[PDB]
């Protein structure tokens, strides 16, 4: 003719263009679809019968782990409260130790301990019950696209319907050949074009997002149609919407694109997609059309009407009715955290990233769908953050200041595992992390090292050992004379104090005489074993009183070493690093090292309970007498810094209060740091400190003179002896 | 399947795209293909037996009309020269009066006249033989494309072959479907592309030039191919190359695109395409590929090799052989005018355009293929141009000057038809046309008006009338006294001069006395009838001597009025304006008006032959005594201007010489203008002036006293009398 000969030649190369398209769609799908960023999780708590935890403590623990209080549990991630129990649906979690599904459980309490954890489905007791970890954040992926991969089955059939009720019928590929005829006929041609009117199948919307550019292609829709004919031909409808539901752009976080319903549900609502309500699903689905302008942060009015349109669109099709309509529209969209949620826990994340580098180097950022399990505690953090946010403006007002900063570090007493980190007064927005970057003179926090060095010598130094408290003059290597004074510029009437009272009252003059008698090399060695940085130790008499500049985290290591009964446990934020296939890339293990004798650490801890009960920290002791806290105070010269090292039955807490410019704070007696700690304790349930005396510890009596007696005596002090017959040697006088 | 269903849908709209293309190709072709600019032609000379023209004059006339001297006439537009004849092939020309073809004719001479014009094909005498006009220029078309439409038959079969030997086989449409397979296979694909290698049929090259843009369309060649399938399907191969041969870009003229072989042949060679030689055809054809870089003006080396490649390409195919090859390559390309040929005859063209406006207004520029027939003379122009180009540097050297300008105007003595116009010393490049724009004091060129006013009164003023030549003092309307002097500051011994000698010697004092006796209103009226602009006449005594500022063209009208025997014929450059269909848009006709009596003009002309023979212009008279030229001289005060008005048997020539800044030229006695005229006469064949005395003219004798005598007398002067018996009335004394 011949429009066929050449018109047939058109058919040939467009079908081979189609086999250039199929051969390239496979390359994407058959393997790496996206670079899935790392998942960062908090601690995984194991509930156990007889555990020292109360009903009120557990509610706060559950709430802190994304659990919602209800009256009728219908969903996973919910809990009810009774007079003596908690009923919960422990959500399914891919636990490293063993994968688990939903568990309907009852936690029966008998104050202040958990008695039983019973499965409500079989009436059987659990030897131990696992709590799922809370997702802290995602480590930013380079191409700026954030996703949390959830398989097809993770998506509830309802959200699947809510989606189809807005964008499909799903009998597709060919993709609505008749839609193109109406879609282009409605507008009555004429160039365009407005409205088209959303002439796109789910398989057309997928190919667009996954494979094609933003716009300028009227050629694209037809090129996308060509791809939406290949995809639904070789991939089942189940895979189409598995890929689709993880790709869809749903929001923004500065320079990071929030995409896919799984990460979106947590981002806007704080729940994994499986736990979403219908009003929540409808909004999320409705956002798809335009994710940026349907922002419940920026313009709720618009989003509050869209969600409501999806509510009204769903009732039009089969599923719902106005009995559940009128109320669903009334329910406010959010359920909105109200925070920008740009960078969660920045201070604690610096430690995580630093530790990730030290343990795996570079060849870890190469991998996809990585799972990072941290030591992070949600309860301890919230309490520390609150103490900072509330305590700082309170102190600024009382003392009257224009600026004031803080730093809190909470570590496991025994394991060294970091539970909480506060880098400033505004922890929600941080760039300077004072917990790891603020190097400061520790002041009187340097005192226990000297007493721990002395008490490590049980045949020479004991708690009843008399120390001179009289004027000092120390000739130094310039000729200048060092004359240290006690905070009050006074000396003891008798010219002497006992070791026990010298540390209880943080006495300067008796600490120098003790330190100088032991010698600086000896005290310098204790500091090394406690775990402080080697390059910060300058062995001059001044260091016995605080001429030692450390960060709160470095201080936390030193006090952990002593709080654990003499075992130095290197501080850490990493519990494990797991690949998507389940390969254990990194696994932490106990590496605690015996630093100082058990008995020497016990006598220091016992004396530290005395500072809190009757000495420098007595104001705290009187507020919480039943906790028997072991602590130590710090106030540097010219009120530059206030410090507090507090030990409960479970944690070591280092609180620092000072100004970024190193200026006076008008606060003394560790008043700043001690009242921030006071709030931290008031904001949660601290563990009472019950000291287990190690072997060779004997409570001995002394007379007013400080000499051991057989029976009686006016004062009882613990002593490191296998044979308390030091009494006889003393009594024989 | 279904790549056919939709692959068949592709066939449908591309064929209807083809019926959108056919419906739009017709719109262009079926009527106005281009806006064909106006054709401007010189005079059409009619050769006639007994005509006062010599063999040498005719050779120069033929050469000036694009005729070539040869030894063996083989082509139209050629001529041979014998001892007593000229043999020529008068080219075919579309004459307004009657269309004509080639005529092989012999012009037999019998010095100084043409005796016979015989047709060499039938041995028959012509009553009159038409000479074809020379193309001066083309009036610029707005879209900047210049073309001269020649039909299919106007193109010789050889140039047609020379073209096919370079760009075709011509069995086309489909257009070399196999060329696309080789053209794209030779380069071995890979994007491009170099060389393609000229994969284009003549029908593809046409559609490209006529319908499509410059580049960026790999889509264009296929779109052009689609058009090259439609054109050769509905238009015969004869029409294809009729359109093609008028479209092809062949050269540039500043901002005007020279396109099509007809206008190109004249542009580079100076001959209509039918008259081209094979080396000429080959070059022109070869230029097509690239017309700009194959420029015989800019880079001959390149063009001298291309033409030679076309010579070598033609021998490869059938037609030629090296016997006519080696020589054809040796022949230098041009045959090149060597002029930029931007704007031919700019000075004379201003008059044409001015006259075109006055006669047809605006609704003439709307029309296409217009033919303008002018009064322009090639022989007179070349002679005038040469006199200017040679005379001016000659005068600059002799007198020693840094600047000097000129202006020459040549008009038909009887009809007023403008034959030549020079606007400056450099006529080849002009923007200021001094012939129509230089308003100057005419000086002594104002003298004949007064004598013509006096001689118009035959009973009062005659040639023998005595005029006083004595000191003058004229009281004027400020109180100041006008005392004019003769050029030499002397007066006649007798205190008197005769009318005849007063004008012969351009005497100032006797011209004032005569003018004042006639009165200024009378002399002012002669000036009106002569045809000078009414607003330039300021009736004060000073105007009798040259206080009258005119342009050389205005001066040409005044002297034409007197040279024609008293008939004012309004000056013109337009003979006719004809449409392409042959519609006479404008036709000029004789409109001569009786201004002054025949006898008064005769006596002024006779006296003007005396100035040339024995008076002010005697230097010219002695060089050409047999021409009996009637003339008048002019030198303004402070040698600002030199003028000369010269009359031969056929023309009035106004020559002006002066400086643009109105400064001294050191030239007197009309030396500048008179020697430019001298050269103009030496550069051609002037017509001897033979005055036919009108009715009532009688040659009468006068004695030394200036009184009419019966017989004898020492001086014979023509007199306006029906009865020479004024002699008796005089003799009776
Ligand atoms: O073919 C045409 C294709 O047309 P598309 O425009 O390409 O598809 C949009 O319009 C369709 C239509 N035919 O009606 C549609 C309504 O069916 C589309 O919905 C679909 N496909 O389900 C609609 O797609 C959506 O287009 C949204 C908004 O389109 C906007 O609609 C208006 C007309 O509706 C125009 O006037 C808009 O300007 C046009 O933008 C897409 O949203 C955009 O998605 C982008 C990722 C966002 O870019 C980010 O924005 C961020 C930010 O703003 N903050 C940052 O700057 C970040 O740097 C930047 O990367 C961008 O912020 C975000 N903007 C909005 C309003 O939502 C959203 O990204 C995208 N959704 C999907 C499922 O792919 C067709 O299929 O119809
Ligand atoms: O399809 C592709 C189409 O390719 P084309 O380039 O569009 O066709 C050129 O190349 C062909 C080829 N396939 O090999 C070809 C050789 O077959 C063409 O010859 C044909 N068609 O017979 C050749 O066409 C010619 O292209 C000439 C030169 O092309 C040049 O070739 C080089 C590669 O050969 C490139 O590197 C050149 O730069 C490319 O320019 C055309 O010439 C141009 O034609 C234009 C009218 C001129 O523009 C004017 O120039 C003036 C001036 O320069 N002075 C003024 O500026 C004026 O303002 C301006 O309008 C312009 O001055 C003038 N330039 C030259 C070198 O000749 C000339 O205008 C034009 N001829 C015809 C018959 O249409 C194809 O058919 O092949
Ligand atoms: C302990 O922190 C202790 N303070 C000091 O030893 C320091 N300064 O205190 C003096 C008396 C110099 C003061 O001017 O207030 C000190 C050591 S290092 C450094 N930069 N300053 C206090 C008194 N004990 S506490 O219990 O009050 O905190
Ligand atoms: C004629 O052209 C005539 N010249 C004059 O009349 C003029 N000037 O001549 C004088 C004597 C003033 C001079 O200084 O040279 C004249 C008239 S109008 C004007 N601007 N100047 C001459 C002398 N006759 S001719 O035959 O030589 O040309």
Tab-separated table of C-alpha atoms in Angstrom, chain B residues 210-488:
chain	number	residue	atom	x	y	z
B	210	UNK	CA	11.145	25.748	0.706
B	211	UNK	CA	9.434	24.340	3.866
B	212	UNK	CA	11.854	23.481	6.709
B	213	UNK	CA	14.180	25.115	9.283
B	214	UNK	CA	18.063	25.156	9.349
B	215	UNK	CA	18.855	22.130	11.684
B	216	UNK	CA	18.402	20.112	14.962
B	217	UNK	CA	16.010	17.702	13.348
B	218	UNK	CA	17.237	14.093	12.734
B	219	UNK	CA	13.383	13.975	12.669
B	220	UNK	CA	13.457	16.577	9.754
B	221	UNK	CA	15.201	14.304	7.182
B	222	UNK	CA	12.416	11.695	7.819
B	223	UNK	CA	9.774	14.535	7.867
B	224	UNK	CA	11.423	15.923	4.619
B	225	UNK	CA	11.411	12.345	3.202
B	226	UNK	CA	7.659	12.204	3.981
B	227	UNK	CA	7.259	15.493	2.000
B	228	UNK	CA	9.652	14.282	-0.812
B	229	UNK	CA	7.216	11.299	-1.244
B	230	UNK	CA	4.167	13.695	-1.609
B	231	UNK	CA	5.819	16.313	-3.989
B	232	UNK	CA	7.176	13.818	-6.616
B	233	UNK	CA	3.764	11.964	-6.325
B	234	UNK	CA	1.670	15.077	-7.271
B	235	UNK	CA	4.205	17.294	-9.181
B	236	UNK	CA	6.010	16.146	-12.379
B	237	UNK	CA	9.876	15.939	-12.398
B	238	UNK	CA	9.834	19.002	-14.738
B	239	UNK	CA	8.064	21.181	-12.080
B	240	UNK	CA	10.348	19.781	-9.251
B	241	UNK	CA	13.510	21.174	-10.945
B	242	UNK	CA	11.671	24.366	-12.171
B	243	UNK	CA	10.996	25.191	-8.458
B	244	UNK	CA	14.445	23.776	-7.360
B	245	UNK	CA	16.436	25.848	-9.911
B	246	UNK	CA	14.839	29.132	-8.665
B	247	UNK	CA	15.116	28.285	-4.889
B	248	UNK	CA	18.765	27.083	-4.332
B	249	UNK	CA	20.891	29.473	-2.179
B	250	UNK	CA	23.815	30.590	-4.371
B	251	UNK	CA	25.297	33.737	-2.790
B	252	UNK	CA	25.158	36.846	-0.586
B	253	UNK	CA	24.896	40.639	-1.232
B	254	UNK	CA	25.240	42.091	2.284
B	255	UNK	CA	21.760	41.524	3.798
B	256	UNK	CA	20.133	40.141	0.584
B	257	UNK	CA	20.198	36.391	-0.147
B	258	UNK	CA	21.028	35.620	-3.795
B	259	UNK	CA	19.040	32.496	-4.741
B	260	UNK	CA	18.303	30.581	-7.938
B	261	UNK	CA	20.623	30.112	-10.953
B	262	UNK	CA	18.962	32.909	-13.119
B	263	UNK	CA	19.908	35.770	-10.747
B	264	UNK	CA	23.209	33.987	-9.803
B	265	UNK	CA	24.439	33.801	-13.445
B	266	UNK	CA	24.009	37.622	-13.812
B	267	UNK	CA	25.418	38.215	-10.261
B	268	UNK	CA	28.754	36.346	-10.772
B	269	UNK	CA	29.067	36.285	-14.591
B	270	UNK	CA	26.796	39.040	-15.975
B	271	UNK	CA	24.819	36.817	-18.408
B	272	UNK	CA	21.306	35.214	-18.304
B	273	UNK	CA	21.540	31.500	-17.370
B	274	UNK	CA	20.673	30.366	-20.966
B	275	UNK	CA	24.033	32.028	-22.149
B	276	UNK	CA	26.316	30.285	-19.575
B	277	UNK	CA	29.423	28.278	-20.593
B	278	UNK	CA	30.069	24.728	-19.191
B	279	UNK	CA	32.853	25.849	-16.751
B	280	UNK	CA	30.327	28.476	-15.491
B	281	UNK	CA	27.452	25.933	-15.094
B	282	UNK	CA	29.780	23.486	-13.246
B	283	UNK	CA	30.879	26.231	-10.739
B	284	UNK	CA	27.255	27.408	-10.147
B	285	UNK	CA	26.099	23.780	-9.644
B	286	UNK	CA	29.104	23.082	-7.347
B	287	UNK	CA	28.305	26.180	-5.206
B	288	UNK	CA	24.928	24.612	-4.140
B	289	UNK	CA	26.555	22.350	-1.515
B	290	UNK	CA	27.863	25.451	0.211
B	291	UNK	CA	27.318	28.800	-1.430
B	292	UNK	CA	29.032	30.915	1.195
B	293	UNK	CA	32.500	29.199	1.355
B	294	UNK	CA	32.703	28.499	-2.426
B	295	UNK	CA	32.956	32.298	-2.985
B	296	UNK	CA	35.090	33.304	-6.035
B	297	UNK	CA	35.412	36.774	-4.363
B	298	UNK	CA	36.674	35.724	-0.892
B	299	UNK	CA	38.540	32.411	-1.483
B	300	UNK	CA	39.050	31.649	-5.265
B	301	UNK	CA	41.584	28.778	-4.526
B	302	UNK	CA	38.691	26.746	-2.936
B	303	UNK	CA	36.110	27.716	-5.672
B	304	UNK	CA	38.779	27.171	-8.435
B	305	UNK	CA	39.117	23.537	-7.146
B	306	UNK	CA	35.386	22.912	-6.633
B	307	UNK	CA	34.368	23.998	-10.137
B	308	UNK	CA	37.302	21.735	-11.274
B	309	UNK	CA	35.862	18.815	-9.156
B	310	UNK	CA	32.440	19.337	-10.950
B	311	UNK	CA	34.434	19.387	-14.256
B	312	UNK	CA	36.087	16.022	-13.182
B	313	UNK	CA	32.776	14.560	-11.882
B	314	UNK	CA	30.994	15.336	-15.212
B	315	UNK	CA	33.668	13.492	-17.240
B	316	UNK	CA	33.243	10.415	-15.044
B	317	UNK	CA	29.601	10.051	-16.077
B	318	UNK	CA	28.731	10.010	-19.789
B	319	UNK	CA	28.784	13.485	-21.449
B	320	UNK	CA	32.357	14.959	-21.520
B	321	UNK	CA	36.011	13.853	-22.252
B	322	UNK	CA	39.526	15.289	-21.439
B	323	UNK	CA	39.811	17.068	-24.885
B	324	UNK	CA	37.321	19.593	-23.442
B	325	UNK	CA	38.410	18.771	-19.807
B	326	UNK	CA	42.061	19.997	-19.421
B	327	UNK	CA	41.124	23.399	-21.004
B	328	UNK	CA	37.827	23.783	-19.013
B	329	UNK	CA	39.813	23.391	-15.716
B	330	UNK	CA	42.466	25.883	-16.963
B	331	UNK	CA	39.836	28.609	-17.739
B	332	UNK	CA	39.816	30.998	-14.708
B	333	UNK	CA	36.440	30.834	-12.862
B	334	UNK	CA	35.690	34.498	-13.479
B	335	UNK	CA	34.563	36.232	-15.689
B	336	UNK	CA	34.073	37.961	-12.272
B	337	UNK	CA	32.857	41.675	-12.290
B	338	UNK	CA	35.124	42.274	-9.184
B	339	UNK	CA	32.598	44.661	-7.666
B	340	UNK	CA	30.629	43.842	-4.518
B	341	UNK	CA	27.514	44.716	-6.632
B	342	UNK	CA	25.608	45.718	-3.455
B	343	UNK	CA	23.539	48.672	-4.779
B	344	UNK	CA	23.930	49.401	-8.542
B	345	UNK	CA	23.393	53.032	-9.732
B	346	UNK	CA	22.406	54.473	-6.277
B	347	UNK	CA	22.136	58.123	-7.510
B	348	UNK	CA	19.828	57.283	-10.492
B	349	UNK	CA	17.850	54.780	-8.299
B	350	UNK	CA	16.781	57.558	-5.849
B	351	UNK	CA	15.012	59.257	-8.835
B	352	UNK	CA	13.392	55.910	-9.935
B	353	UNK	CA	12.058	55.192	-6.370
B	354	UNK	CA	10.898	58.868	-5.925
B	355	UNK	CA	9.028	58.664	-9.281
B	356	UNK	CA	7.590	55.181	-8.461
B	357	UNK	CA	6.020	56.738	-5.290
B	358	UNK	CA	4.560	59.799	-7.143
B	359	UNK	CA	2.940	57.588	-9.876
B	360	UNK	CA	1.793	54.419	-8.011
B	361	UNK	CA	2.001	55.319	-4.286
B	362	UNK	CA	2.064	52.311	-1.947
B	363	UNK	CA	-0.092	49.751	-3.726
B	364	UNK	CA	2.729	48.779	-5.900
B	365	UNK	CA	5.033	47.169	-3.357
B	366	UNK	CA	2.315	44.626	-2.660
B	367	UNK	CA	2.705	43.021	-6.127
B	368	UNK	CA	5.118	40.207	-7.217
B	369	UNK	CA	7.249	39.768	-10.386
B	370	UNK	CA	6.900	43.478	-11.305
B	371	UNK	CA	8.888	44.846	-14.317
B	372	UNK	CA	10.153	48.481	-14.226
B	373	UNK	CA	11.422	49.938	-17.546
B	374	UNK	CA	13.647	53.063	-17.068
B	375	UNK	CA	15.172	55.832	-19.294
B	376	UNK	CA	18.715	54.883	-18.001
B	377	UNK	CA	21.598	54.866	-20.520
B	378	UNK	CA	24.572	52.483	-19.914
B	379	UNK	CA	26.917	54.288	-22.405
B	380	UNK	CA	26.190	57.824	-21.025
B	381	UNK	CA	26.533	56.573	-17.407
B	382	UNK	CA	29.877	54.729	-17.906
B	383	UNK	CA	31.264	57.867	-19.667
B	384	UNK	CA	30.003	60.170	-16.856
B	385	UNK	CA	31.266	57.807	-14.077
B	386	UNK	CA	34.738	57.579	-15.780
B	387	UNK	CA	34.915	61.412	-16.214
B	388	UNK	CA	34.221	61.771	-12.441
B	389	UNK	CA	36.572	58.903	-11.231
B	390	UNK	CA	39.440	60.214	-13.457
B	391	UNK	CA	38.807	63.998	-13.548
B	392	UNK	CA	38.491	64.587	-9.791
B	393	UNK	CA	41.919	63.052	-8.657
B	394	UNK	CA	43.493	64.796	-11.723
B	395	UNK	CA	42.088	68.207	-10.541
B	396	UNK	CA	43.010	67.507	-6.850
B	397	UNK	CA	46.661	66.967	-7.984
B	398	UNK	CA	46.942	69.969	-10.440
B	399	UNK	CA	45.391	72.574	-8.110
B	400	UNK	CA	46.463	70.683	-4.987
B	401	UNK	CA	43.472	69.884	-2.777
B	402	UNK	CA	42.597	67.376	-0.040
B	403	UNK	CA	38.879	67.183	-1.048
B	404	UNK	CA	36.812	67.880	-4.242
B	405	UNK	CA	33.368	66.680	-5.350
B	406	UNK	CA	31.324	66.578	-8.614
B	407	UNK	CA	27.778	65.961	-9.998
B	408	UNK	CA	26.717	65.184	-13.644
B	409	UNK	CA	23.066	65.029	-14.983
B	410	UNK	CA	22.381	63.983	-18.643
B	411	UNK	CA	18.787	64.379	-20.038
B	412	UNK	CA	17.156	63.937	-23.467
B	413	UNK	CA	17.200	67.369	-25.193
B	414	UNK	CA	13.614	66.923	-26.533
B	415	UNK	CA	11.794	64.482	-24.210
B	416	UNK	CA	13.343	65.309	-20.803
B	417	UNK	CA	14.131	61.578	-20.205
B	418	UNK	CA	17.079	61.162	-17.729
B	419	UNK	CA	19.926	59.108	-19.333
B	420	UNK	CA	22.703	59.583	-16.672
B	421	UNK	CA	23.183	60.765	-13.029
B	422	UNK	CA	26.448	61.092	-11.001
B	423	UNK	CA	26.132	61.953	-7.310
B	424	UNK	CA	29.856	62.163	-6.497
B	425	UNK	CA	33.593	61.557	-7.271
B	426	UNK	CA	33.108	57.926	-6.065
B	427	UNK	CA	29.819	56.977	-7.909
B	428	UNK	CA	30.360	53.229	-7.193
B	429	UNK	CA	29.647	53.902	-3.461
B	430	UNK	CA	27.169	56.640	-2.651
B	431	UNK	CA	24.922	57.821	0.124
B	432	UNK	CA	24.801	61.520	-0.547
B	433	UNK	CA	23.564	62.191	-4.082
B	434	UNK	CA	24.800	65.699	-5.085
B	435	UNK	CA	22.764	65.595	-8.341
B	436	UNK	CA	19.454	65.838	-6.382
B	437	UNK	CA	20.712	67.107	-2.940
B	438	UNK	CA	23.463	69.741	-3.551
B	439	UNK	CA	21.649	73.143	-3.592
B	440	UNK	CA	24.138	75.714	-4.975
B	441	UNK	CA	24.259	79.277	-6.387
B	442	UNK	CA	24.097	78.662	-10.192
B	443	UNK	CA	26.204	81.778	-10.875
B	444	UNK	CA	26.368	82.816	-14.555
B	445	UNK	CA	24.064	79.834	-15.512
B	446	UNK	CA	21.327	82.417	-14.561
B	447	UNK	CA	22.377	84.644	-17.489
B	448	UNK	CA	20.427	83.000	-20.448
B	449	UNK	CA	17.056	83.554	-18.671
B	450	UNK	CA	17.470	87.399	-18.948
B	451	UNK	CA	18.533	87.200	-22.666
B	452	UNK	CA	15.708	84.720	-23.397
B	453	UNK	CA	13.285	87.224	-21.700
B	454	UNK	CA	14.656	90.091	-23.864
B	455	UNK	CA	14.776	88.045	-27.120
B	456	UNK	CA	11.097	87.039	-26.521
B	457	UNK	CA	10.345	90.721	-27.460
B	458	UNK	CA	11.427	90.753	-31.206
B	459	UNK	CA	10.357	94.377	-31.894
B	460	UNK	CA	12.353	95.757	-28.936
B	461	UNK	CA	15.361	93.454	-28.212
B	462	UNK	CA	17.469	91.745	-30.921
B	463	UNK	CA	21.020	90.327	-31.078
B	464	UNK	CA	22.369	93.700	-32.393
B	465	UNK	CA	20.685	95.730	-29.548
B	466	UNK	CA	23.218	97.997	-27.787
B	467	UNK	CA	23.486	97.610	-23.989
B	468	UNK	CA	25.305	100.127	-21.724
B	469	UNK	CA	28.546	98.871	-20.072
B	470	UNK	CA	29.299	101.650	-17.536
B	471	UNK	CA	29.483	101.892	-13.635
B	472	UNK	CA	26.278	100.854	-11.731
B	473	UNK	CA	25.005	101.883	-8.209
B	474	UNK	CA	21.704	100.328	-7.100
B	475	UNK	CA	19.953	101.699	-3.994
B	476	UNK	CA	18.423	98.690	-2.121
B	477	UNK	CA	15.838	98.260	0.767
B	478	UNK	CA	18.371	98.779	3.645
B	479	UNK	CA	20.017	101.908	2.204
B	480	UNK	CA	23.163	99.910	1.245
B	481	UNK	CA	24.448	100.293	-2.313
B	482	UNK	CA	24.793	97.410	-4.823
B	483	UNK	CA	27.648	98.126	-7.249
B	484	UNK	CA	28.187	95.009	-9.463
B	485	UNK	CA	31.428	94.646	-11.410
B	486	UNK	CA	32.540	92.725	-14.514
B	487	UNK	CA	34.927	89.773	-13.709
B	488	UNK	CA	37.934	91.877	-14.947
